[PDB]
Amino acid sequence: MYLRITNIVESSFFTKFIIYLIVLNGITMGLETSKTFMQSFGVYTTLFNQIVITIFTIEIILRIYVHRISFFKDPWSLFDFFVVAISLVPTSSGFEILRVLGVLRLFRLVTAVPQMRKIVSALISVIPGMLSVIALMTLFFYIFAIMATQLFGERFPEWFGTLGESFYTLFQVMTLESWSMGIVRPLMEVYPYAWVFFIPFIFVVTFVMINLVVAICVDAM
Amino acid sequence: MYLRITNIVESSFFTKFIIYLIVLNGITMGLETSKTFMQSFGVYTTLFNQIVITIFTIEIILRIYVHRISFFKDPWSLFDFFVVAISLVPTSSGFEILRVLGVLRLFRLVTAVPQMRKIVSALISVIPGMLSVIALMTLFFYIFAIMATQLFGERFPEWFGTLGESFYTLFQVMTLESWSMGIVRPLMEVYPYAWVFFIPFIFVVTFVMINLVVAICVDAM
Amino acid sequence: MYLRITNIVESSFFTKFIIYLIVLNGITMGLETSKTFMQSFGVYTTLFNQIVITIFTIEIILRIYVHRISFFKDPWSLFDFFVVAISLVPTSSGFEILRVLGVLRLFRLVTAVPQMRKIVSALISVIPGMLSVIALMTLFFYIFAIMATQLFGERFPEWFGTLGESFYTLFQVMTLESWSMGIVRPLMEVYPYAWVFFIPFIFVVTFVMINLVVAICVDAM
Amino acid sequence: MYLRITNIVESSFFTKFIIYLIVLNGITMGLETSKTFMQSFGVYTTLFNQIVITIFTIEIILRIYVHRISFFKDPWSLFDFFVVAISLVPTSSGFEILRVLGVLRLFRLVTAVPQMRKIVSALISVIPGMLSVIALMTLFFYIFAIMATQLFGERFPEWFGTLGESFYTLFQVMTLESWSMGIVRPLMEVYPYAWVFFIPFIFVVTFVMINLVVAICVDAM
Ligand SMILES: CCCCCCCCCCCCCC(=O)OC[C@H](COP(=O)(O)OCC[N+](C)(C)C)OC(=O)CCCCCCCCCCCCC
Ligand SMILES: CCCCCCCCCCCCCC(=O)OC[C@H](COP(=O)(O)OCC[N+](C)(C)C)OC(=O)CCCCCCCCCCCCC
Ligand SMILES: CCCCCCCCCCCCCC(=O)OC[C@H](COP(=O)(O)OCC[N+](C)(C)C)OC(=O)CCCCCCCCCCCCC
Ligand SMILES: CCCCCCCCCCCCCC(=O)OC[C@H](COP(=O)(O)OCC[N+](C)(C)C)OC(=O)CCCCCCCCCCCCC
Ligand SMILES: CCCCCCCCCCCCCC(=O)OC[C@H](COP(=O)(O)OCC[N+](C)(C)C)OC(=O)CCCCCCCCCCCCC
Ligand code: NA
Numbered sequence: 044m045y046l047r048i049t050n051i052v053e054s055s056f057f058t059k060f061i062i063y064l065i066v067l068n069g070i071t072m073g074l075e076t077s078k079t080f081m082q083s084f085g086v087y088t089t090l091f092n093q094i095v096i097t098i099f100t101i102e103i104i105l106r107i108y109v110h111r112i113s114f115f116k117d118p119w120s121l122f123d124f125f126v127v128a129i130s131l132v133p134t135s136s137g138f139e140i141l142r143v144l145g146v147l148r149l150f151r152l153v154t155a156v157p158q159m160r161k162i163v164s165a166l167i168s169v170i171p172g173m174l175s176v177i178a179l180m181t182l183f184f185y186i187f188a189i190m191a192t193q194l195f196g197e198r199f200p201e202w203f204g205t206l207g208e209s210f211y212t213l214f215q216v217m218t219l220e221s222w223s224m225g226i227v228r229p230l231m232e233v234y235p236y237a238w239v240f241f242i243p244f245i246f247v248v249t250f251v252m253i254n255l256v257v258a259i260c261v262d263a264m
Numbered sequence: 265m266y267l268r269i270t271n272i273v274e275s276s277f278f279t280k281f282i283i284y285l286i287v288l289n290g291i292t293m294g295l296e297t298s299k300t301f302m303q304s305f306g307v308y309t310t311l312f313n314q315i316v317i318t319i320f321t322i323e324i325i326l327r328i329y330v331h332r333i334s335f336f337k338d339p340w341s342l343f344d345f346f347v348v349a350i351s352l353v354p355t356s357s358g359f360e361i362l363r364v365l366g367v368l369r370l371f372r373l374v375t376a377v378p379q380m381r382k383i384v385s386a387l388i389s390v391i392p393g394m395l396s397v398i399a400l401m402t403l404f405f406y407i408f409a410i411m412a413t414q415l416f417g418e419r420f421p422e423w424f425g426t427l428g429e430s431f432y433t434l435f436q437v438m439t440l441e442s443w444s445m446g447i448v449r450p451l452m453e454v455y456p457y458a459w460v461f462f463i464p465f466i467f468v469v470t471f472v473m474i475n476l477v478v479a480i481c482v483d484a485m
Numbered sequence: 486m487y488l489r490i491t492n493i494v495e496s497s498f499f500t501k502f503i504i505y506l507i508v509l510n511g512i513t514m515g516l517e518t519s520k521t522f523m524q525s526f527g528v529y530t531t532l533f534n535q536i537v538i539t540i541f542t543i544e545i546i547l548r549i550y551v552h553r554i555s556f557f558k559d560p561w562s563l564f565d566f567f568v569v570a571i572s573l574v575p576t577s578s579g580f581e582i583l584r585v586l587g588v589l590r591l592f593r594l595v596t597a598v599p600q601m602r603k604i605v606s607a608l609i610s611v612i613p614g615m616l617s618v619i620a621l622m623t624l625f626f627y628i629f630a631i632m633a634t635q636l637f638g639e640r641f642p643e644w645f646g647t648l649g650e651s652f653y654t655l656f657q658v659m660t661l662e663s664w665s666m667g668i669v670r671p672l673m674e675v676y677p678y679a680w681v682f683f684i685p686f687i688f689v690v691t692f693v694m695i696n697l698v699v700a701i702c703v704d705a706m
Numbered sequence: 707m708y709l710r711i712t713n714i715v716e717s718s719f720f721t722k723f724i725i726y727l728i729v730l731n732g733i734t735m736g737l738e739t740s741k742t743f744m745q746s747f748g749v750y751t752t753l754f755n756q757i758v759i760t761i762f763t764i765e766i767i768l769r770i771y772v773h774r775i776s777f778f779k780d781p782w783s784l785f786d787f788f789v790v791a792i793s794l795v796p797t798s799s800g801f802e803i804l805r806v807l808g809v810l811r812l813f814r815l816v817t818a819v820p821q822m823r824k825i826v827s828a829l830i831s832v833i834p835g836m837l838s839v840i841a842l843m844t845l846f847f848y849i850f851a852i853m854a855t856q857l858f859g860e861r862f863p864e865w866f867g868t869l870g871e872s873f874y875t876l877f878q879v880m881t882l883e884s885w886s887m888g889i890v891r892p893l894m895e896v897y898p899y900a901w902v903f904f905i906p907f908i909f910v911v912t913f914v915m916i917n918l919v920v921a922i923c924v925d926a927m
């Protein structure tokens with residue numbers, strides 16, 4: 044019977060039907076946002092959702108027999124697998140984080156549809172030639188996060204009280220968001236030389252970012 | 265008589281006259297801004313405006329006889345047509361949006377003048393090789409807008425109470441405007457892990473923008 | 486005697502002496518910033534300044550005889566000329582704007598020193614192949630400035646009350662500075678669809694900027 | 707005995723041991739951040755730290771005998787030397803800046819590990835072909851800092867009262883952070899034409915940054 048199901052799974056109908064459900068489930072997910080819609084067509088949509096996930100677990104099961112070991116060596120299938128399993132976890136229990144991560148299954152639209160695969164693939168293939176710079180950056184943040192924590196955390200707990208708060212804050216400074224009016228001007232009211240820490244930080248982190256972007260421009264070319 | 269008008273329309277004088285009215289109408293539109301100017305030369309300018317639009321409907325009518333089917337297959341002509349038709353709708357009725365969309369006819373300066381067409385054309389031709397990325401991005405926002413709405417909308421209605429509000433807020437975050445001091449620091453006062461949602465969002469959305477620009481740099485070359 | 490002065494003007498000493506005064510005057514200008522320095526060495530520096538400008542008017546006069554018509558066809562000489570004339574206007578009278586524009590003479594360091602000329606020249610030569618885009622942008626701003634003025638100026642005078650205030654505000658939105666928390670969120674409290682005006686504005690203006698930068702990247706390459 | 711130590715120092719074990727201590731010290735530096743961890747394992751970590759720095763002074767001393775004059779002509783060795791010497795200065799005395807600059811020794815991970823050297827080297831080699839532009843920029847800030855100080859410092863001391871304050875504020879404006887809502891809108895309430903100073907400043911400074919990046923894009927290619 045292997046070939047009988049294999050010709051189902053491999054068919055255009057099968058794929059088109061799945062893509063059809065993605066778009067349908069996607070639309071219905073946005074409708075579940077409205078409190079109004081849910082007081083009317085609430086149960087309609089709730090049952091519709093348990094229907095789709097069933098059709099998708101079957102689909103994933105059918106796909107696995109047809110592909111066996113090849114399935115679990117396909118990034119796109121693994122994604123499909125993990126995103127459907129997330130969606131499988133019971134409505135209650137633990138936390139509702141899982142209930143929300145369910146919406147991630149709309150990314151199956153990238154999986155099921157080629158051309159989307161193409162862009163995602165292109166975007167991703169750029170990432171390996173970045174990891175050395177990313178690593179450098181992460182070491183850099185880690186070193187300045189520790190300095191900021193022990194230089195400013197006592198008198199500025201919310202922003203630098205903790206290694207994590209300092210990472211967060213340093214990230215924010217990197218995006219240049221309120222770095223002066225909101226963080227460094229207030230800091231200087233106690234520590235007039237705080238600028239000797241953040242200006243060089245901003246220069247480096249910006250300089251790197253420019254280089255990182257240049258990398259992708261030159262390397263893709 | 266066809267050719268008699270065709271030599272009018274196709275002439276150098278004709279175009280130069282029209283461009284002359286654009287610049288004249290454009291200048292007059294900026295003066296209609298001054299409350300002072302309107303209490304003096306109010307009626308002067310109001311009559312001048314109904315005159316020009318008449319001259320432009322004639323022009324569009326003349327252009328259509330001379331070009332017929334070719335006219336409505338010319339992007340620039342269509343623009344000219346639609347931007348003049350907007351301007352034709354009566355002074356009152358419905359809303360005053362139409363009175364304002366009238367000023368869009370100054371983009372007729374781009375139509376009437378070559379060299380302008382060229383740059384607009386150059387800018388636009390870049391857009392097809394972007395739609396896959398734009399599509400990816402739009403799906404991306406939609407998935408995160410839905411997550412944010414159901415994760416933050418209850419306790420943060422202004423920013424995430426509604427799918428549209430979440431789209432808006434997520435857009436703002438993408439521009440990096442006040443994303444931390446204005447949105448994510450407040451959110452974390454209730455949801456200490458909100459940062460697990462917005463930092464990866466900012467990374468992805470930034471990464472893409474960088475790639476999108478790299479695309480245009482490499483692809484234009 | 487022409488050649489006698491021409492060999493003075495053309496000498497290394499002459500140029501080196503002038504550059505020496507630039508750096509000296511530049512340093513002294515920063516010292517004139519200190520209220521403390523001026524209560525001590527105030528008169529020392531004040532006389533020193535009238536000395537230098539004299540040496541520079543002579544220099545410009547000497548240079549003109551040696552170059553005649555060629556002088557006033559040299560951008561760098563013209564700059565040198567106009568920046569020294571600004572500096573010549575009496576200490577009082579009219580406004581003190583002139584007293585401040587004097588510091589612009591430190592840009593003579595770019596003039597007098599080659600290599601600086603080289604970078605400035607390189608930076609400038611890029612500008613012609615931008616003017617079509619700049620023109621487009623300026624028309625664009627002008628059209629949206631007028632729309633914003635008549636859509637938001639009544640209820641938001643500070644930001645859109647006037648064509649100029651609208652230009653200013655639209656510029657600010659373009660830099661993405663507080664565009665949402667500071668301008669468009671407040672606007673939406675009265676005009677819930679204000680977002681239909683500013684989001685498309687931001688997209689266009691950003692898109693253009695990206696293209697403009699791409700232009701310089703591809704064209705220099 | 708020279709060669710006896712040279713085979714120690716030059717060995718694979720030796721380097722691997724040192725990198726092992728870097729990562730160990732780095733990890734331990736991040737734990738010294740926790741107030742909790744220090745009341746427990748406080749002395750454990752404090753002793754561990756004086757141990758490592760000893761091991762590193764030995765290492766630097768061993769490396770110097772093996773390399774002599776070549777050592778102090780190696781950028782990476784010099785860094786190693788200076789970053790370890792910082793770490794040597796006694797726990798108290800003067801200020802605690804030295805205690806903090808100690809954490810800079812984690813950049814030893816860049817020294818000790820190849821591939822890291824490569825990226826740092828790649829990033830740095832880009833800097834020479836920038837110094838002309840940096841120089842132009844520095845002159846530029848200096849001229850405008852002086853203008854801003856004497857135009858705005860009297861009525862706006864916090865932001866422009868002093869040449870250094872003006873440098874700081876002008877830097878912030880360059881990052882575009884709150885330049886309008888936070889600095890130029892307030893300034894205009896007293897000086898309605900302040901915009902004639904900051905808009906052209908923002909244009910020039912932005913233009914240059916764009917060019918500077920274009921330089922690195924074209925020049926790296
Ligand atoms: C890799 C480059 C970036 C690394 C640069 C790190 C430099 C850190 C700058 C210090 C910023 C503020 C730190 C600070 O503690 O505040 C200023 C202190 C004065 O306060 P402090 O003495 O700490 O005691 C606090 C008492 N209170 C609350 C009443 C002020 O007094 C000072 O801290 C003065 C600091 C001036 C010397 C710093 C210049 C050294 C640059 C590093 C050179 C080697 C690496 C490149
Ligand atoms: C490639 C094309 C790009 C065009 C470049 C755009 C440059 C436009 C600069 C206009 C900026 C002036 C705005 C301003 O100063 O405040 C707004 C004022 C309102 O002041 P207000 O006190 O209410 O009354 C003015 C009194 N009056 C009429 C006797 C002068 O109201 C006015 O000033 C109205 C002045 C409007 C003149 C605009 C002329 C631009 C030519 C347009 C060329 C293309 C047309 C399609
Ligand atoms: C590679 C990226 C790494 C992250 C991927 C997923 C990792 C999942 C970690 C999540 C674990 C912690 C999240 C969590 O506990 O939920 C926190 C809240 C839900 O409310 P909750 O904190 O339980 O209620 C406290 C407030 N109260 C008591 C006053 C009601 O809701 C929140 O704000 C959580 C923040 C959202 C993050 C949860 C995952 C969404 C991220 C999906 C996209 C990530 C990149 C693609
Ligand atoms: C290529 C290298 C890049 C390295 C990647 C950097 C990622 C580091 C993530 C650290 C973020 C965690 C920060 C955080 O959660 O809050 C700060 C806490 C303070 O909390 P606290 O309540 O005060 O006490 C902690 C209790 N304890 C010790 C028993 C666990 O204090 C701590 O959590 C201290 C934890 C520090 C562990 C850091 C390990 C990073 C390895 C460094 C590798 C390179 C070394 C040269
Ligand atoms: C191509 C760029 C075009 C601009 C180039 C130069 C054009 C010169 C136009 C200046 C004419 C108007 C300036 C002016 O009136 O001075 C305004 C104030 C001085 O105080 P003032 O307004 O007289 O006092 C009123 C306040 N009160 C009564 C309470 C004391 O001080 C100010 O805030 C004026 C704002 C500074 C602009 C003056 C020129 C400096 C720009 C130099 C760099 C421009 C680009 C390189
Ligand atoms: Na301030």
Ligand code: NA
Pocket residue numbers: 224225226229
């Ligand atoms: Na703050």
Ligand code: NA
Pocket residue numbers: 201445449
């Ligand atoms: Na805060």
Ligand code: NA
Pocket residue numbers: 445446447450
């Ligand atoms: Na807020």
Ligand code: NA
Pocket residue numbers: 422666670
């Ligand atoms: Na808000």
Ligand code: NA
Pocket residue numbers: 666667668671
């Ligand atoms: Na506001």
Ligand code: NA
Pocket residue numbers: 643887891
């Ligand atoms: Na305001």
Ligand code: NA
Pocket residue numbers: 887888889892
């Ligand atoms: Na302020």
